[PDB]
Design a protein around this motif. Structure first.
Motif, PDB file in Angstrom:
ATOM      1  N   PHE A 196     -15.155  -5.925  -8.406  1.00  0.00           N
ATOM      2  CA  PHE A 196     -14.171  -5.464  -7.633  1.00  0.00           C
ATOM      3  C   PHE A 196     -12.969  -5.307  -7.903  1.00  0.00           C
ATOM      4  O   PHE A 196     -12.408  -6.556  -8.229  1.00  0.00           O
ATOM      5  CB  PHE A 196     -14.343  -6.120  -5.859  1.00  0.00           C
ATOM      6  CG  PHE A 196     -15.771  -6.184  -5.401  1.00  0.00           C
ATOM      7  CD1 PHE A 196     -16.614  -7.348  -5.967  1.00  0.00           C
ATOM      8  CD2 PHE A 196     -16.307  -5.149  -4.727  1.00  0.00           C
ATOM      9  CE1 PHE A 196     -17.973  -7.312  -5.395  1.00  0.00           C
ATOM     10  CE2 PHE A 196     -17.406  -5.337  -3.999  1.00  0.00           C
ATOM     11  CZ  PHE A 196     -18.443  -6.364  -4.460  1.00  0.00           C
ATOM     12  N   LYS A 197     -12.367  -4.142  -7.780  1.00  0.00           N
ATOM     13  CA  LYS A 197     -10.607  -4.404  -8.205  1.00  0.00           C
ATOM     14  C   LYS A 197     -10.191  -4.261  -6.853  1.00  0.00           C
ATOM     15  O   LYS A 197     -10.598  -3.609  -5.883  1.00  0.00           O
ATOM     16  CB  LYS A 197     -10.421  -2.803  -8.777  1.00  0.00           C
ATOM     17  CG  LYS A 197     -10.867  -2.915 -10.255  1.00  0.00           C
ATOM     18  CD  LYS A 197     -10.801  -1.531 -10.974  1.00  0.00           C
ATOM     19  CE  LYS A 197     -11.001  -1.813 -12.448  1.00  0.00           C
ATOM     20  NZ  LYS A 197     -10.805  -0.451 -13.008  1.00  0.00           N
ATOM     21  N   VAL A 198      -9.242  -5.296  -6.673  1.00  0.00           N
ATOM     22  CA  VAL A 198      -8.591  -5.583  -5.426  1.00  0.00           C
ATOM     23  C   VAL A 198      -7.280  -5.394  -5.489  1.00  0.00           C
ATOM     24  O   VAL A 198      -6.366  -5.857  -6.382  1.00  0.00           O
ATOM     25  CB  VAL A 198      -8.978  -6.985  -5.017  1.00  0.00           C
ATOM     26  CG1 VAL A 198      -8.374  -7.447  -3.746  1.00  0.00           C
ATOM     27  CG2 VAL A 198     -10.443  -7.271  -5.136  1.00  0.00           C
ATOM     28  N   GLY A 199      -6.601  -4.745  -4.263  1.00  0.00           N
ATOM     29  CA  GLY A 199      -5.131  -4.540  -4.270  1.00  0.00           C
ATOM     30  C   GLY A 199      -4.742  -5.106  -2.902  1.00  0.00           C
ATOM     31  O   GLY A 199      -5.504  -4.829  -1.933  1.00  0.00           O
TER      32      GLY A 199
END
Ligand code: 6K9
Ligand code: GTP
Ligand code: ACP
Ligand code: GDP
Ligand code: CA
Ligand code: CA
Ligand code: CA
Ligand code: MG
Ligand code: MG
Lengths: 54, 439, 428, 342
Positions: free
Chosen positions: B351-354
């Motif tokens: 998962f890419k998380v911001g």
């Protein structure tokens, strides 16, 4: 389960977590389509006016 | 700082655009007058918010947006609305008579007479940009203008801006709020023509939004205003990275890179939580775990489908509010061993998380409650192909009888375009199945 | 902002035409002097669709009154709202049409048709963006039927890209016993099949039966019938003159209602059914409105919907009610009788709701159906036609005006084809 | 007035269910392509789950669980049991199985070498006949390559429980109904599909004392119906046999294990197929097939997603389906099931 590329700032932060690794038509052509459609309209209307003239 | 221009087409595009730019102004502290007190640098600058707003010498912040509608009635409300001083008249473009829910009328007949005008108006905004990223295009599938004119515009944009990125915000037709029986026709036609021209499209099913408003906002009979304020929250969550300081999805190109492995399969599923009613006396604030878990509930998706019976190609988590990486990672750990999350073999399960510390801004007097933390998940799953299946089946039912087809042929469109568009959709379903299905 | 031009021809056309204008004038807060006294600002938001403006704020009906004799148009002037009409928009002759289609279409009417188009042309020039025309007339007579369809043809020739809509009163032996009406109607239908986009089939047969069986009127008058016609015309035009999302203009309506070009003949419906001067004591609920508007006894076309299938349906609810309950009720009707709705046109039932109710009612419902059962109406007309034509009875009244028998055969063949086309989609 | 559609004419079970619904006078059958239905008796292959639950004003229910094929495919079931930690090698009721393509070939060969140093196996696929029993791996591998589709190699139970008199093999069919709430209902009435010809350890080629299929027993057997009618023995008789011959009971010696296996399989895949929060609801009837060895140990052989029923049991089971799986969702104007709580 690994965290990477953790970037932080005043507004917040971001990162990536890995749980597991892996196992156009030209302007010319567009005009030719639009004008070809218009001609079909002109033809259809011309027939109606011819039919109404009869 | 690279600029972004938003283009709103047809009624759905305009009215949704209204909601978004209203929310943007609140989020950035910009007044209806256009004045932004916190902006210390008068008449210019290259801050993150400048990607969506340009500036004048008088300290006015105007949206980098153009509104286009073949009928004047809807945009007239914007010309006289509370945000009338926000846009200069050039940005607001209208015709006399609309596309009458007819793709061919919006694309060929009427579209031919205003396309050069719109492009010239767009060229003026582009000239004001020092480094244009591309465009964000809002429109419905079902309308004649939203479907027909948009596809014409996207074709012209690829010609005049062959390198710039173009993202879509598309409204998928729903019977509960639809106004035309031929919306399936219009949807397939515009998707076929726009497919090679769009880099990443976020579909929003009015059915999903309608039910969310009823279920979670306790609204008995949701209006467009109800739907659009919710939609604007999702859109805001998605564009926040372009308007604020951060490191995730900083430019339009990142959306394609992070979400779109295959060019044709560029339809990410959006899921949002939490949606809380402002009418509820008090409310137990949901944790990071609870809102994250809700991202895997079909009832919170912008398109109702079952991601359990598909595969993931990418997943992005966009948090707003009180969130730290530690609690997110723990939430994901719990969920991964609890729910069915399968990625394609040629992709990493990740998962890419911001995170944006600033909590979701809500419209004063709206129906959404203020929360301390929210999340929008963007997941490219093959499960969204269910929406293509449904739409294509309704197409087939009518087209087999050639119902309503004469309305399109009458506008100059050839019948052969129907089957061509449909066969393109047929291949699209096959692509999704190839990627997400096995034995 | 998109203007509609209204035309009323012949005795029936002018009588229902006038009754239509006084009703909507009321709903939009317009008095017989043409001044706005309305309280709501909704009445004025789209009032330009049917009205023009002027200094002193005078709202003038964009209507053209037509006839081959002065009689009925005299009645229009005398009684209100007779003075709201633009005086130069009265176009009339002296000879009459003598209930003869040929006289209206070929001889008498041909002489007057040009002066009518001049007025139509002047109105069209005042429009910022004309969307189309609506015609009121009967099919059984001579002027409305014959000259009416002549006008439609000449209007289409000059405005080929505009929508043509008509309110067409179908002849019935129960209301009028003029023997040649089946001839006049069959000749007219032939014209409508070709030259209109939308035709509301207002059947005097159904109008009579409603007044007799339901309203318990032993001897119904034309005033009684026009009471039903007026309410219907108000109901079907609600989405055109008030702020709305569904079927807001003529073209969007046609696109939603007409899957095939020749099949544009609609069965109108209304609830509750009332009589003039008779105050109803109890307002209906949403469930009651929904059940009644779909009831066979509430149809203005005199066709049994159970005998066919719905291609498309438009429903309009007026008054202050629950949108939620309206949605529920409209849903159950379809789900309860899903067989009668064609499955190859998904979600073919659309619903609209307007807050402003009709006069004398807190709420009502108007039904517009494209049903294959309409074939019964044309089938009734066709039988009355062939009974006479197979013996060439009364034909000399027409051949005397220059017509040939072949023109009758062609008209008959086209109407019969229309019937068979409805039948084929009823078995799809 | 509820509405339903039929998209599987070949289903004898739901043909009876369709008859009962109509007999209530509160259900109406629509054209198979009418979307305005409450209940769908869907097809066996490529059921369009994606078009369900998108009809406003309608609560829709379908007689299949999307994804239940993972349990009802021979290759799928094997992979499921091995990879699922809820089952894994901690599963002592499933015969040693391997998936082979015309892949676990090496692992199967390694297992074949160890057994040789009781080494009888059986080859079969999801796609009568099509089965081969052998002691030599080369024979089985040649057949799998001989056939077209993928096959499953499974250890053949060499020491099955034998009914006397007759000395004959048999299998047990259990019908299980899972409703929209994922309640797991075991039909109290099961059936024993018996072999007519006595079990012979030597000759495997004479497949009639080894295969207990109802079709094979009425096409390759001359002792069809001599011991029991239609080679079908029910629980009352089998219970009496177990009591007289073994002094035990069906419930204790066998049924406890069956309930355990059923619960285990269905609970495992629950999070993957449950429709609890879905826009449409599912239920489904399953056919579990078991084997029993001489030590009264129950083994799972396979699971059928589209099972038929015993002739005598149709009326009761199909009615139970209406009572529990349909009327529970669409109410009208002691129980034959055993609820496997979880
Ligand atoms: C008398 C008259 C004279 C006057 C004629 C008006 C009108 C309007 C125009 O259409 C044409 C018609 O009327 C034509 O009407 C015909 C003459 C030419 C006239 O010719 C034209 C024009 O004249 C006469 C009729 O058809 C009258 C009908 C006839 O039933 C068939 C009669 C029973 C029959 O006598 C026995 N079998 O009951 C009458 C029933 C109808 O009464 C009328 C009111 C009575 C009627 O207003 C109301 C409607 C709503 C109705 C229900
Ligand atoms: N969510 C949302 N959907 C809308 C809105 N307005 C219209 N729609 C949807 O859009 C579809 C109709 O298309 P429109 O955008 O209204 O038509 P158009 O683009 O103006 O084109 P025309 O046919 O010329 O009027 C229907 O499915 C509506 O449900 C809106 O404000 N919000
Ligand atoms: N591993 C094994 N050991 C011993 N016997 C076995 C076995 N596998 C299958 N059998 C025998 O195989 C027969 C069933 O074949 P199988 O069920 O696998 O094919 P099938 O699916 O076509 C029939 P059904 O679906 O009705 O159970 C049983 O009756 C049983 O006697
Ligand atoms: N509903 C209704 N029908 C009418 C009215 N006037 C005439 N008709 C019908 O119209 C037919 C006669 O045509 P008419 O309009 O009078 O002849 P025209 O003047 O030549 O067009 C008959 O079938 C009448 O029943 C009216 O006011 N209302
Ligand atoms: Ca600045
Ligand atoms: Ca491109
Ligand atoms: Ca003369
Ligand atoms: Mg529009
Ligand atoms: Mg099997």
């Amino acid at each position: 389960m690994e965290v990477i590329e953790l970037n932080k700032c005043t507004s917040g932060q971001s990162f990536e977590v890995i749980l597991k690794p892996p196992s156009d038509p030209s302007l010319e052509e567009i005009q030719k389509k639009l004008e070809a459609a218009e001609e079909r309209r002109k033809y259809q209307e011309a027939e109606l006016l011819k039919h109404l003239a009869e | 700082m690279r600029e972004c221009i938003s283009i709103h087409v047809g009624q759905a595009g305009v009215q949704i655009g209204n909601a978004c730019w209203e929310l943007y102004c609140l989020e950035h502290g910009i007044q209806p007058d256009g004045q932004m007190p916190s902006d210390k640098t008068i008449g210019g600058g290259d801050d993150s918010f400048n990607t969506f707003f340009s500036e004048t010498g008088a300290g006015k912040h105007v949206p980098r947006a153009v509104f286009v509608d073949l009928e004047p009635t809807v945009i007239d409300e914007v010309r006289t609305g509370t945000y009338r001083q926000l846009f200069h008249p050039e940005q607001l473009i209208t015709g006399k008579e609309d596309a009458a829910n007819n793709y061919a009328r919006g694309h060929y007949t009427i579209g031919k007479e205003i396309i050069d005008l719109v492009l010239d108006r767009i060229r003026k905004l582009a000239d004001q940009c020092t480094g244009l990223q591309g465009f964000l295009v809002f429109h419905s599938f079902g309308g004649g203008t939203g479907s027909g004119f948009t596809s014409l515009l996207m074709e012209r944009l690829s010609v005049d801006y062959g390198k710039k990125s173009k993202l879509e915000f598309s409204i998928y037709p729903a019977p509960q709020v639809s106004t035309a029986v031929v919306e399936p026709y219009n949807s397939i036609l515009t998707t076929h023509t726009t497919l090679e021209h769009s880099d990443c499209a976020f579909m929003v099913d009015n059915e999903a939004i309608y039910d969310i408003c009823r279920r979670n906002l306790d609204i008995e009979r949701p209006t467009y205003t109800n739907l659009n304020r919710l939609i604007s929250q999702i859109v805001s969550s998605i564009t926040a990275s372009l308007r604020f300081d951060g490191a995730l999805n900083v430019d339009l190109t990142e959306f394609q890179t992070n979400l779109v492995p295959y060019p044709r399969i560029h339809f990410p599923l959006a899921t949002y939580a939490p949606v809380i009613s402002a009418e509820k006396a008090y409310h137990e604030q949901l944790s990071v775990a609870e809102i994250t878990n809700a991202c895997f509930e079909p009832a919170n998706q912008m398109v109702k489908c079952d991601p359990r019976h598909g595969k993931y190609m990418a997943c992005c988590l966009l948090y707003r509010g009180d969130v730290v990486p530690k609690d997110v990672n723990a939430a994901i750990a719990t969920i991964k061993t609890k729910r069915s999350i399968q990625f394609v073999d040629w992709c990493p399960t990740g998962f890419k998380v911001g995170i944006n510390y600033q909590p979701p801004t809500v419209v004063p007097g709206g129906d959404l409650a203020k929360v301390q933390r929210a999340v929008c998940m963007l997941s490219n799953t093959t499960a969204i192909a269910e929406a293509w299946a449904r739409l294509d089946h309704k197409f087939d039912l009518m087209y087999a009888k050639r119902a309503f087809v004469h309305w399109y042929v009458g506008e100059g469109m050839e019948e052969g375009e129907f089957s061509e568009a449909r066969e393109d959709m047929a291949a699209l379903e096959k692509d999704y199945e190839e990627v997400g299905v096995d034995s | 902002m998109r203007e509609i031009v209204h035309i009323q021809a012949g005795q029936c056309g002018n009588q229902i035409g006038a009754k239509f204008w006084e009703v909507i004038s009321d709903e939009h807060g317009i008095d017989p002097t043409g001044s706005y006294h309305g309280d709501s600002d909704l009445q004025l938001e789209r009032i330009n669709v049917y009205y023009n403006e002027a200094t002193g704020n005078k709202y003038v009906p964009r209507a053209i009154l037509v006839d081959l004799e002065p009689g009925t148009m005299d009645s229009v002037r005398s009684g209100p709202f007779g003075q709201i009409f633009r005086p130069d928009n009265f176009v009339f002759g002296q000879s009459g049409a003598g209930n003869n289609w040929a006289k209206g279409h070929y001889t008498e009417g041909a002489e007057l048709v040009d002066s009518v188009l001049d007025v139509v042309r002047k109105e069209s020039e005042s429009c910022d963006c004309l969307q189309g025309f609506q015609l009121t007339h009967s099919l059984g007579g001579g002027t409305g039927s014959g000259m009416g369809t002549l006008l439609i043809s000449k209007i289409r020739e000059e405005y080929p890209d505009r929508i043509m809509n008509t309110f067409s009163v179908m002849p019935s032996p129960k209301v009028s016993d003029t023997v040649v009406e089946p001839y006049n109607a069959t000749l007219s239908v032939h014209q409508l099949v070709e030259n209109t986009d939308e035709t509301y089939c207002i059947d005097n047969e159904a109008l009579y039966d409603i007044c007799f069986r339901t309203l318990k009127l032993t001897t119904p008058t034309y005033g009684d019938l026009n009471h039903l016609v007026s309410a219907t015309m108000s109901g079907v035009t609600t989405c055109l003159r008030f702020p709305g999302q569904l079927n807001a203009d003529l073209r969007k309506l046609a696109v939603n209602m007409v899957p095939f070009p020749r099949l544009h003949f609609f069965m109108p419906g209304f609830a509750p059914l009332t009589s003039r001067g008779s105050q109803q004591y109890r307002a209906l609920t949403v469930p009651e409105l929904t059940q009644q508007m779909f009831d066979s006894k509430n149809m203005m076309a005199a066709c049994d919907p159970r005998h066919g299938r719905y291609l498309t349906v438009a429903a309009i609810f007026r008054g202050r009610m629950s949108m939620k309950e309206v949605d529920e009720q409209m849903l159950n009707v379809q789900n309860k009788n899903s067989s009668y709705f064609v499955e190859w046109i998904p979600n073919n039932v659309k619903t609209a709701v307007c807050d402003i109710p009709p006069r004398g009612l807190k709420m009502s419902a108007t039904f517009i159906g494209n049903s294959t059962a309409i074939q019964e109406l044309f089938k009734r007309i066709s039988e009355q036609f062939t009974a006479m034509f197979r013996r060439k009875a009364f034909l000399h009244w027409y051949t005397g005006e220059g017509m040939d028998e072949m023109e009758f055969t062609e008209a008959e063949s086209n109407m019969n084809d229309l019937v068979s086309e409805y039948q084929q989609y009823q078995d799809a | 007035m509820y509405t339903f559609v039929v998209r599987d004419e070949n289903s004898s079970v739901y043909a009876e269910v369709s008859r009962l619904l109509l007999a209530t006078g509160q259900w109406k059958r629509l054209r198979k392509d009418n979307p305005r239905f409450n209940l769908m008796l869907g097809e066996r292959n490529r059921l369009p789950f994606g078009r369900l639950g998108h009809e406003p004003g309608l609560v829709q229910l379908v007689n299949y669980y999307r994804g239940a094929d993972k349990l009802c495919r021979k290759a799928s079931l094997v992979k499921l049991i091995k990879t699922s930690p809820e089952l894994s090698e901690s599963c002592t009721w499933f015969p040693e199985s391997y998936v082979i393509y015309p892949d676990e070939r090496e692992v199967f060969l390694a297992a074949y070498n160890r057994r040789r140093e009781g080494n009888v196996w059986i080859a079969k696929s999801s796609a009568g006949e099509g089965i081969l029993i052998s002691s030599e791996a080369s024979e089985l591998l040649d057949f799998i390559d001989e056939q077209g589709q993928v096959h499953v190699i499974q250890k053949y139970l060499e020491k099955p429980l034998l009914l006397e008199p007759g000395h004959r093999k048999f299998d047990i069919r259990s019908w299980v109904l899972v409703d929209h709430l994922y309640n797991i209902y075991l039909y109290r009435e099961g059936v024993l599909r018996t072999s007519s010809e006595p079990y012979n350890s030597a000759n495997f080629q004479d497949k009639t004392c080894h295969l207990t299929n109802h079709c094979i027993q009425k096409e390759y057997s001359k002792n069809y119906g001599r011991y029991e009618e239609g080679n079908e023995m029910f629980f009352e008789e089998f219970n009496q046999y177990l009591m007289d011959a073994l002094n035990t009971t069906l419930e204790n010696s066998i049924l406890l294990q069956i309930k355990h296996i059923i619960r285990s399989c269905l609970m495992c895949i629950e999070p993957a197929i449950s429709t609890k929060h879905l826009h449409y609801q599912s239920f489904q009837l399953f056919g579990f097939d078991f084997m029993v060895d001489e030590e009264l140990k129950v083994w799972l052989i396979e699971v059928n997603g589209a099972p038929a029923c015993a002739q005598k049991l149709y009326a009761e089971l199909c009615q139970g389906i209406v009572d529990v799986a349909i009327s529970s969702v669409f109410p009208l104007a002691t129980s034959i099931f055993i609820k496997l709580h979880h």
